[PDB]
Symmetry: D2
C-alpha cells in the first residue's frame, strides 16, 4: 500500500496498470536526474540555491547564445550556490555542469530558387533565397524537402543546378532573415564540430565541466571528433550525443557505442522527422540505452506551458511520467528554467512526477528482461551488481550503498533498475557530479581523510551513507540495506555484498 | 518492415521498444476514435465537412454553456455535414453526437458563510456564500477548498454553526461566482442538477448517441442518469466522467453501472495532485480494457494547438501514450471548439493514433487479455477470440463483423486485434455508437433486406469488402476474416470465415 | 475439479505441478495413439478384437522375423477383427497397419551351436576374409560388413550382441581390425554389430527390405517404419522404392544411431514422421543420453507439426507381469507430457503373457497425462514458434483451437478428405478431442499418427446438395461424440468445414451447441 | 555447447527441448543425492567402499526386516568404508545413514486357496479364525477396519493382487464380493484405498527401532505410512530430546497422505515419494501425478524430496536398465527431486554397483537439461518477500552464479541452513558447503546441489583467518574434484560474526593458484 507495491506484485502488465493507486504515496527518494537549462531567470546565486533545494542535479549551459564571459559567470554562480551547502557533507548534493554545443547549422505553392552565390547574402528576397551550406547540392536530389525557420516553411526540390536549386513551396508563411534550415533524410556533410564549437569545447575543458551535450551527432566519427577536441586534458568528460535528425536515428547503434550517453533531442528531432514519429524514436533510444547500460536524456518541451503558467498541462504531466516509465535516466527543462516565469515550480513538478512514476514502473518484468538481455561475463563487479539488485528486491531494502572511485560499480547497479536508491559514496568530486546521469544514483562526496587501516576507512564511508540515508529520510534504524565494497586495499574492484541493518549509530 | 512488425515479433517488451522504427510506416486504418468538441471555430457546415474528412468520429456538445437553440443548430449542422457524404455509402462515415452534461494574500484568513452575501465579493468580506448549502457537513479538520479552477487554495481551521474559517495556502486575486472543488470530500450534491434534467430530456428529443455524465462519484449517480433517460432513452450509452477522488476510489462500482468511462483529466487534475493524474489514467484505461468497456482519454492533449499550427513534443507524446495505454478514444476540448487550427489538431490526432496503434505490443497484450478473460459457455465470445487469433496468424487486412446491436463487434474489439474491424450494420445508432470501441470502423448498409437470408449476408459482406478496398485497408488477394451468424436475429454470431479479398 | 483444470489455470509451471490432483478424474477421450506390435500373443481374430476394444489404434508388423504368408495372415486377422465392428459406423474405430522394416544389419559369423569367452583386455582380430565365415573363435571374429575399415578409425568402438560385448580398434588394416575387448561376455554366432559414432555406408534398404516394401504395397499397408535411417537420402530411397503405387504410404523414419540424431533435421524434413527408436538408440548411444535424444526429437516434431512415436520398453516388465513398474508408469506419462503423438508396445503385445493389460495401461496413463499437460504454456509457445502464413486453413485451424480453449469445448469436429485440416488442428495441441470425419478409409487409418485425432469413417453416399452433405457428416460426428461419451446435448463444439466441394478449402469455423438427436 | 548451454539460452520450453544435445557433455559435478538400500548384496566393507566410489551418498537401512544386531553390523560396515577415505579431507565424501521404519501394517491370518471374481468373501475380526482362513472366511489383525470402511469401499490383499468390494457392514465382520481373484496365501499385507486408517503413527516395533536409531547416531528417519501432521509429531516425540537433530522424512504412501500433504510437509524435514505402496494404494496411472505434485510443493517450500522405488528395477537381474528406467531417473531429476533411491537394486540384486553408477550418469545428464531460465524465474517469483538477510544473500548469490557461470557457490555453514537456502533456488553451479559439524555434512546430501565437505582443521584463534582457512579448503576441494580451476570465478558466502544465523556476505572471487 505504499510505493505502488500492490501493483508491483501483479502477474501481468495489464493488472499492474489496473492496480496503480493514487492513494499509494511514493517513497521519499527520487531517482531520475533533473537537468535545468540556466539563463536569465535562473543565474543568480540566490535563485540557484532554491533551484538546488527544488531538485536540480545538472546545470545545462546552452552555447547557442552568450559569450564565454557570460557562461563563466553562470558556472561561477552555480558553484557558489552548490558550495553554500558544503559545510554539512551529510546534506551536500553534488551538482553537475553540462556544456551544450551550438553545433553546425544551415542559415538564411510558388516557385522558389535557392542560390549559393554570395552576392545574394545581402539581398534575400521572396523569389531567390541564399543559404550558407556550400555542399547542399551534393546531399540533396529531385524530391528532397528543405525546411526553413524551425519547420514553418517547407520546399520540395524540382531541379538541380551547379550553384542553385529550384523548389516548389509546400507549406507557406513569412520568411525572415538568418533563419534555420533543416534537410530531412539527408546525409549532411557539415563538420562534426563548427569553428565555434572547437572554441567552446576547449573552454569547457578549461572550466572543468562534467559533460558535453554534442549537437547534431549523425555517426560514430562525429563522436570521435568531439572526443579528440576534448583531448587528453578532457578525457574524463562524458560525451552525451544529441540525436536530432533521421541519420542520427538510423545510425543510432554506432553513435551509442562511441558515446557515454544519449540525449533524445526532441526539439530539432521533431522538426527533422514528422512530429507523430518522435515518440517512436524516443522509446527506441531509451530502450537501447537501457539495454547498453548508458545514460539517456529525454529533452525539450516537457512542461513547456510552465514558461508562462505556475502549473503544467495534463499532456506535460503525462510526458514526464511516461519518460520515466520508458526508462529515461534524466528529464530536462529548456527555457522552463532558462527564461520562464516559475522556474522553481517547473523543477519541483519534475521532481514530484518523476517520483510517482518511479513507483509505477513494473520492476518485476523490467528486471527479468534486463537480466535475460544482459550478456554473461566473467566480470565480478557485474555479477556482484546483479546479485545486489536481486537481494534488494528480495528484502525491500531501503537502499543499495556503493563505495566507488570512478562511479563504475554504481553505474552497473543502476543499469538493472533497482527500486531502492543507490547511495554512491566517493571521494572523487567529478564521479559524484557525473553519477547524476544514471537512474537511481544518489551521489555523496566524502571529505574525510583516508584512514590508515583499510577496514576502518570502508566502515567510515559506509556510516556516512547510513547518515545520509537517515537524514534524507530514505530509511531509519533497523531497516535492511545492501552494501557493495571491494574486499582488499585499492587492489581488485567491487566484489563484496553485505546485507546489513541500518544501525542506531 | 511495415507497421512495426519487426517490433511486434520481439520476445520482450524491452526489445519491442528497441525495435520501434520511424522508417516502418503505419497502415492507412486508424483504430482510435477521435471525439471533437464543437464550438465557434467548428460549427459551420463547411468546417464540419473538412472536420469529418480530417478524422472526426464523434461531435461533443458541451452543455456547460449555450442554449438549447444554439446546440440544436450545432446538431443540425453536424447532420448536414455528415449526410453530405451519404450519396456514396461506400465512403459514408457515421458520425456520433455526444451530449456532455455539467452538474456541479498568501496566508490571509477568509470566512466562508452560507447566509446570503451575493451583494459583496471582496477579500475583506472574505469568500462569498457560494451555492453549496451542505459544505460544512462534508469538510473536516485539515480539509482543503480550491477556488477558481484550483488557482486559490484554502485549508479549514475552525468549524462553526453556519460558517467555516480558513487560512489560504495559495494566495491570489479572488473573483466572483467561480468554481469550487473539495479534494477528498464525499460531495452530497445531486447526481444530476435541475439544468441537467432539462438537458438530458433535450438529448433524448435530439436523438443523441451518448451522454458524458459529469462528476460521477458512485454507482447510484449512474443509475440516476439512466432513470432520467428512462425507457425512451434506454439505448443511449452513458459514459461516466471520473473527475475527483471519490470517483477514482469507487471506480469499480461506477464502471459496472456505466457503458463506458471518460478520464476527465481537467477537473481530475484540479481535484487530485497533478503528478498523480497519469496513475489514475492508466488504472482506468486498464480496468476498462479488462472489462471490455470503452474508455476516453480527455482534455489537454494538444492544448497548444489552440494558438499554434503544430503541437508540443509533450502533446505528441501524450496522444501516443494514451493509445499505448489502451484508450478507445482520444478527445479535443477547445483545440476544436474555439481555437485556430481546429482541422490541424484533428489531423494530428489521426496521424499520431495511427503510429501508436502499430507500436502496441500485441503479442503481450493479447496473451494478457486472453488469460484475464473468464471462460464462458457463450458461443459469440469463443467466435470473437477465435477470429482475433486467426487475424494475428494471417496478418489479415480486416475483421468483418455483421452486427445489429454492435455487440459482436464490441466482443472482437476487446481482444485488441491489429486488423481494423469493419462492422456492417443497418442500425444507424449502432453505427454511430461503434466509434466508442478501439478498431471498429462502422459502415451503414442502406440496401433493403433481401428475401433470402444467405444472399442478404453476402450483400453486407461484399459491402464491407468494397469499403476496405476503397478506404485502402486491403487489396485483392489479401486475406480477411468474416464473422456472421447462423440465423436472422442478434445474438447468434457463431461463424468465422477466412477469405481472400476478391 | 476435473481434467486437472485447477492445474490448467496456474500462472507458473511450478504451481502447475503443485496443483496436479489424483482426485481430478480425466475425461473419456484418450488422444495419444497406441501402436501394438502383433505376434504370437496377439494375432488371433479373437485377441485382435479385444486389442481394439482395449485401445489399439495401429497394428505394427515387425519384418525382422516371419514369412510373407505369416504376416499376410496377421494383416487379414487385423482386418477381420477391425471390420467386425463395421456394422455400427457410430462405434467403428479405424485401425492402421504398419510395416516395420528389418533394415540393414552387421552380423558376426559362426562357432554346431557353441559359444566362446571374451575377457577383460584380451586381443581380438576382426576379419573380412570369408575363410573365417564358420570359424569364429575368441582370437578371430568374422563380419559381413565389407566396408567396416573405411568407416572406423583408431580409437573407434565396436559393439557386439545388442551391446553385450564392446571392442576398441587399436590397429587398422586392409581386410582386418585388431581390437582390445573392453566389456567381455559370452560370444555366440550370427550376432548383431553396432558402430557408435560411425558414418555407416550400408544401403538405405536391404535386399530383404525391397521384397518387404513391395509386399507392403501389395497388402495396402498405411505406413512404413523404416529402420536405421541415417540421412535424408535414406528416406528418399524408401520413397522411391515405394514409387507411384506406394506414394500415399506414410514413411516414419526410425532414428536409432548417432548419425540419425545428428542429421535429424534433414531426416524430419524428408519424412512423414519419426519413431524414437529407443532400443537400438540405447545400444548406439550411452543409455543415460537417450532421454535427451527423445525430448529433442519430440520437440522438433511438435515444432514441425510431424508425427512422432515414442517406442520400446515402455511397459517392459508387463511381458511377464500383469502390472507395470513405477518407472514404466512414469515413462508413459512423461512421453505424453513431452508431446509424443503415439506410444508403442513391442514384446508386451507381440509375445508377452499380458497383451491386453499392457494396451489398457497405456490407455489409462496416456489419458491422465493428457490432462496434466500445461496447455497454457504449450499453446503460447506453439503459436509463437509457428510461421505467419497467408494460408486460410492454418488461420482457421489456430482460430479453432483458440476458440476450443475459450469455451472448454467437448470436441473440434473437422471434415477432411486428405486428413490435412485435422492434422493442422492437432499440431496446436488442443485438449479437446478432434473428431475427423472422412470418407477416405486410408485418411481415417493414417490420422491415428496425430495426437488428438479421433478418425471416423463416414459410409453414407455423397448427397446431391453440398450443404446437406456437409450437415450429414457433421451430425455423424455429433452422434459419434454422444455415443463415445465425449459430450452430451447442450455442450458446445467447434465445427471446421469449407466453403466449396474440393480439398484445401477448409476456411469456416462454427461454434455450435450439441443438438437433440 | 558443453552443459546443454545452447538449450539453456532458449526463450521457450519447446525450443529448450528442441536444443537438447547428446553431443553436449555434462560437467563433473553431480547434484542429485543417491540413496542406496543396503542388504546382502551390499553390506560388506569392500562392496560399500566401491558403492561410495560409484556415488552412494546415503545408506538406507530397511527395518521391515533384520534384527538390531544385523543393522548394527550394517552401520558399522558403512562407517568403516566411509572412514577409509578420511585421511584425505580434500577427497573425503560424507555418507549419511538413514533408518526406514516398518510402520503399521494390516496383516491376514493363516498353504493357499483360490478366490473367484463374483464370489462372496466374509472378512472377520473374531480371533478364533486366526488359523482357519479359507476361500469363504478371512482373518485380519486391524480391529477397527469396520469403522473406517463403508458399503462400496475396496480392500486390497497381497500387494494389491486381490481386490474386494464391501457389500454389507456388520459389528465385527464385512461381507465382500471379489473383484480381482488370485491365489490367497497366509500372513498377507492389506491396503484400504481412500480410507482414514486409524492405526497408530508408530508401531510397538517402530518405537524400539527409532530408539535404536538414536542409539546408533543415524542422520535421518524415513517414517512409513504418514497420513497427517500428528503422525510426524509422534515420530518427533519418540525421537525425543536426544534425537532432536535427526531429520524426519515423511513417506507418503496412501490417499490420505497425498490429500493432507500440506500439513505433513509443514511438520516434516522432507518427504519420500514412496511410489511402491503408493501405487498399491492409488491407481498406478495416477502415481506420476502424485509424484509431480509432491516434488513441486517440496521445491516451492524448500524442503528435500526423495523419488523412490523401481527406478532401475530390471537391474536387479541385468547389468543395464530398460529405456523406461533411464527415462524415469532423468524425469525425476527434471521434476526437481533432491534425491533418487535404489531399493532391491542395491539391497539384494546382482549389479548393485552398476545401478549406483547409472543413477550417477543419468542424474548428471538431466541436471544439465533443466531449464534454469524458467525454474529460477518461477522460484524467485513464488518465494515470499522477507526481512531475513540470509534469504536475501542466498538469492543474491544464486543470481550472481547465473550471471558469471560460476564454477561453484561456496557456503560456510554450521547447521547446514545457509546452504539449504541456496539450494532451494536451484543454481546450476554446485554448492560447496564447508562445515566442521559431521552431522551437518551427512545431512546436506538431502538437498540438490550441496556437496558437503568436512573441515577437520583446528579452530584458529583469529576469527577472520579461520573463515579464510575454510574458504581455501573449499577452493582446494573444487580444484581437486574438477569443479573449477585457477582463474575461474566462484561465489563465496560467509557471515559477519561467529555462530549460526549471521550469513549476510557474498563475494565473487577468482579461484587463486
Ligand atoms: K520399510
Ligand atoms: Mg530397432
Amino acid at each position: 500500500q505504499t510505493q505502488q507495491l500492490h501493483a508491483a506484485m501483479a502477474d501481468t502488465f495489464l493488472e499492474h496498470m489496473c492496480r496503480l493507486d493514487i492513494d499509494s504515496p511514493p517513497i521519499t527518494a527520487r531517482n531520475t536526474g533533473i537537468i535545468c537549462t540556466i539563463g536569465p531567470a535562473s543565474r543568480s546565486v540566490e535563485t540557484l540555491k532554491e533551484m538546488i533545494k527544488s531538485g536540480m542535479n545538472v546545470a545545462r549551459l546552452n552555447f547557442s547564445h552568450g559569450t564565454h564571459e557570460y557562461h563563466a559567470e553562470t558556472i561561477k554562480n552555480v558553484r557558489t550556490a552548490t558550495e553554500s551547502f558544503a559545510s554539512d557533507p551529510i546534506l551536500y548534493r553534488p551538482v553537475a555542469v553540462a556544456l551544450d554545443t551550438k553545433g553546425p547549422e544551415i542559415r538564411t505553392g510558388a516557385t522558389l530558387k535557392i542560390t549559393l552565390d554570395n552576392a545574394y547574402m545581402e539581398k534575400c528576397d521572396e523569389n531567390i533565397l541564399w543559404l550558407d551550406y556550400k555542399n547542399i547540392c551534393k546531399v540533396v536530389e529531385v524530391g528532397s524537402k528543405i525546411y526553413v525557420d524551425d519547420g514553418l516553411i517547407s520546399l520540395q526540390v524540382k531541379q538541380k543546378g551547379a550553384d542553385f536549386l529550384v523548389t516548389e513551396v509546400e507549406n507557406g508563411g513569412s520568411l525572415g532573415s538568418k533563419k534555420g534550415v533543416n534537410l530531412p533524410g539527408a546525409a549532411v556533410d557539415l563538420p562534426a564540430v563548427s569553428e565555434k564549437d572547437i572554441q567552446d569545447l576547449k573552454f569547457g575543458v578549461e572550466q572543468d565541466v562534467d559533460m558535453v551535450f554534442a549537437s547534431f551527432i549523425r555517426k560514430a566519427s562525429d563522436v570521435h571528433e568531439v572526443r579528440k577536441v576534448l583531448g587528453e586534458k578532457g578525457k574524463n568528460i562524458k560525451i552525451i550525443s544529441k540525436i536530432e535528425n533521421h541519420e542520427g536515428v538510423r545510425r543510432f547503434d554506432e553513435i551509442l557505442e562511441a558515446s557515454d550517453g544519449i540525449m533524445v533531442a526532441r526539439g530539432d528531432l521533431g522538426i527533422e522527422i514528422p512530429a507523430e514519429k518522435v515518440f517512436l524514436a524516443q522509446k527506441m533510444m531509451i530502450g537501447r540505452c537501457n539495454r547498453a547500460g548508458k545514460p539517456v536524456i529525454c529533452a525539450t518541451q516537457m512542461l513547456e506551458s510552465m514558461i508562462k503558467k505556475p502549473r503544467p498541462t495534463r499532456a506535460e504531466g503525462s510526458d514526464v511520467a511516461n519518460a520515466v516509465l520508458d526508462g529515461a535516466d534524466c528529464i530536462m527543462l529548456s527555457g522552463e528554467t532558462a527564461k520562464g516565469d516559475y522556474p522553481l515550480e517547473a523543477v519541483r513538478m519534475q521532481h514530484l512526477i518523476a517520483r510517482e512514476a518511479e513507483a509505477a514502473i513494473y520492476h518485476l518484468q523490467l528486471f527479468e528482461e534486463l537480466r535475460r538481455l544482459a550478456p554473461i561475463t566473467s566480470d565480478p563487479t557485474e555479477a556482484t551488481a546483479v546479485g545486489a539488485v536481486e537481494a534488494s528486491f528480495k528484502c525491500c531494502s531501503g537502499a543499495i550503498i556503493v563505495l566507488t572511485k570512478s562511479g563504475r560499480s554504481a553505474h552497473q547497479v543502476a543499469r538493472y533498475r533497482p527500486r531502492a536508491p543507490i547511495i554512491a559514496v566517493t571521494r572523487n568530486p567529478q564521479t559524484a557530479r557525473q553519477a547524476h546521469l544514471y537512474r537511481g544514483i544518489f551521489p555523496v562526496l566524502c571529505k574525510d581523510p583516508v584512514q590508515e587501516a583499510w577496514a576502518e576507512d570502508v566502515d567510515l564511508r559506509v556510516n556516512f551513507a547510513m547518515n545520509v540515508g537517515k537524514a534524507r529520510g530514505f530509511f531509519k534504524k533497523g531497516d535492511v540495506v545492501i552494501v557493495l565494497t571491494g574486499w582488499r586495499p585499492g587492489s581488485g574492484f567491487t566484489n563484496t555484498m553485505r546485507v546489513v541493518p541500518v544501525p542506531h549509530h
